[PDB]
Design a protein around this ligand. Structure first.
Ligand code: I8M
Ligand code: I8M
Length: 283
């Protein structure tokens, strides 16, 4: 069923809460035993947001391989994403170890460091060229190379050095800075423009490891970003773009990480974003 007429229909009947609860009831439940081990309590931001065992990213070390991060592998679309929490003071070294080990070219950040007067993630990248960061626990160095500040997003070029081998790589930091403290954006236009900038960078392409995507918990805004990207690619792959079922794609992604899309308003915004992104690509 075409999504745009459908959208107006779901609006007219005011049933977003009921649709969202149907998704919550049908979502996968898989074990997260590693996340819940007592030795990992200070590696989780939120007690109710954990990676499944089957899809968790493992750190390459014998001591403790745990990070709150999941591999979302979309078979038909041929896209993969790592979705992770905003890094904590004691996991900033693990975060950059993961980017290094997974061969990622891009990090996508959808939150501010402070929102609602509280800290939503650590200041995990350097703010000045001449003040680099060293992560002694994982033996990495990170340098700010350049910063481009725009009205709706900032893009940074970073240099990550593995101090063990003296190898270096160029990481692109895509920072969406305008998501409102409460609710969702009124228009999806700036979010869709941002998605198009990440795509045009090569960060989502199969010659690199998966993009790393985060917000504060790594399920709400982060879920909206991957859901919109996969749905729009499927529309360009299929003979019938109207066959793409956003609720079925979201339930496929929920096989790999719990809780993706945290509210009925985020569900509406995703449908909104896919509907408006379809129109712009059309011709
Ligand atoms: O290298 C890219 C290619 C396509 C898109 C984006 C980038 C990253 N740029 C951000 C700041 O300007 C120089 C690098
Ligand atoms: O790439 C195209 C060119 C002309 C017409 C249609 C498409 C497919 N779009 C459908 C809407 O969703 C994104 C792809």
């Amino acid at each position: 069923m075409e999504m745009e007429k459908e959208f107006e229909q779901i609006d007219k009947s005011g049933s977003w809460a009921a649709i969202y609860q149907d998704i919550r009831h049908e979502a996968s439940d898989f074990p997260s035993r590693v996340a819940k081990l007592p030795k990992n309590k200070n590696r989780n931001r939120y007690r109710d947001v954990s990676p499944f065992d089957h899809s968790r990213i493992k750190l390459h070390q014998e001591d403790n391989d745990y990070i709150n991060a999941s591999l979302i592998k979309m078979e038909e679309a041929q896209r993969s994403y790592i979705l992770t929490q905003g890094p904590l003071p004691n996991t900033v070294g693990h975060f950059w170890e993961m980017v290094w080990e997974q061969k990622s070219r891009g990090v996508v950040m959808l939150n501010r460091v402070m929102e609602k007067g509280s800290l939503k993630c650590a200041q995990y990248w350097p703010q000045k060229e001449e003040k680099e960061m060293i992560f002694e626990d994982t033996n990495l160095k990170l340098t700010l190379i350049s910063e481009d500040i725009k009205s709706y997003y900032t893009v940074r070029q970073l240099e990550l050095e593995n101090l063990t081998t003296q190898e270096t790589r160029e990481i692109l930091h895509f920072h969406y800075t305008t998501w409102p403290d409460f609710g969702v954006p009124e228009s999806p236009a700036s979010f869709l423009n941002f998605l198009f900038k990440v795509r045009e960078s090569g960060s989502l392409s199969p010659e690199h490891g998966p993009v790393v995507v985060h917000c504060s918990a790594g399920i709400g805004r982060s879920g909206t970003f991957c859901l919109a990207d996969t749905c729009l690619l499927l529309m360009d792959k299929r003979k019938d773009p109207s066959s793409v079922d956003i609720k079925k794609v979201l339930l496929e992604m929920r096989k790999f990480r719990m809780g993706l899309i945290q509210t009925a308003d985020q569900l509406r915004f995703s449908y909104l974003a896919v509907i408006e992104g379809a129109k712009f690509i059309m011709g």
